[PDB]
Design a binder for this molecule. Sequence first.
Ligand SMILES: [Zn+2]
Ligand SMILES: [Zn+2]
Lengths: 226, 226
Amino acid sequence: ASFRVVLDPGHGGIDGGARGVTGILEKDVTLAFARALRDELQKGSHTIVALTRDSDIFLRLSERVKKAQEFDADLFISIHADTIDVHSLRGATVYTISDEASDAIAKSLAESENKVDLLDGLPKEDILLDLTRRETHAFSINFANNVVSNLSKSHINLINNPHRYADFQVLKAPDVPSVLIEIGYLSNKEDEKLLNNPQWRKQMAASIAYSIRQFAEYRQKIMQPL
Amino acid sequence: ASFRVVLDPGHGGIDGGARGVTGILEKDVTLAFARALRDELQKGSHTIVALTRDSDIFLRLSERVKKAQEFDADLFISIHADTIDVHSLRGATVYTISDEASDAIAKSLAESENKVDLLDGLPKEDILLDLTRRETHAFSINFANNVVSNLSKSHINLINNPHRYADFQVLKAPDVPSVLIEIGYLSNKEDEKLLNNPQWRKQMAASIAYSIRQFAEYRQKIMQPL
Ligand SMILES: [Zn+2]
Ligand SMILES: [Zn+2]
């Protein structure tokens, strides 16, 4: 069966996201990275990919989640390259959702990343469900773990404690495993140099694509009892 | 939190299980292995272990499952060293439950292993539930995968296609992740030599204990939304 993946290039349109010292914008880096990851996935077999946006447009976080659900996604990956409070912090990071943040950096990052909805100048927006949520979370965690493992094997630099968590609204799908990947932090000058290198970006995308293939193979082993 | 594991030494009492050429009995090997795995787990931190039997007694498969549930187990491992139809087949194997067998060897093995209940000479014995079952199965699969991965890293010999599946009644807990591990096959002369070596058994138990620790760390990352 074809495994279904939705990629969400963070920011877009009026929301440029973080800005590097060279002028490079997060919204452009995330779209370029998403396109590279799509390409890597499409080189493989049995993965069908869609992007929340494949152009420079603004989308509310809830609309990104809705697109993943409308696609019947098996996995949702939101792609970012943010500024964080400490400029010395650098390296790939994977975040999953949690009410309680793993640490102060993660907490502050989610607070800021959730607020971008307001940039359009418009206002802010069951047991069976809770069980589904728990199952989804197990999958999100599994994927995050695998991504970190394979990035490490590929000698791609990871931040200390590279699996973190906080209350990211873009990760709220109750029924689609979801992670947010910081490919690097535009607040760090060394990460900015990696982020603007398309060959480095391709190498990271290739590692994530491998992780996705492994996750697909795992998911397809699981029973369907309904 | 203390991760809760129930180990099930296959067979027991009137059911000797498979018999090696040296006279060694499966029921004795599985109890010895379970005790070694208990010891390895108890050397670690944060694992609480119980055995379905810690003596030479016969237990129906349903009673083994009930004991896992009564203990509020987070993981159930049934330990075996069976005879299979092809004597040239050897190596550690992990089985998970499925209505449809992975292959003819797995199918025949489950048929035979389910029939042991009859050795006492007595007769043979919901959406929310189905969802719980699906979640449990994801965990069973995850653990099986990790066990195979770590056995390989430890240079412990694995059978070809070392993750298999069939309709094993001892793996029927809807709410406890469950696997059946063949530590080797007493139908194979080389496996018999490994099986009777307590140092080799200890090395395999140590690898499984490591896999359990990794599984515990994973399980404890997952949300509790109820
Ligand atoms: Zn961002
Ligand atoms: Zn057996």
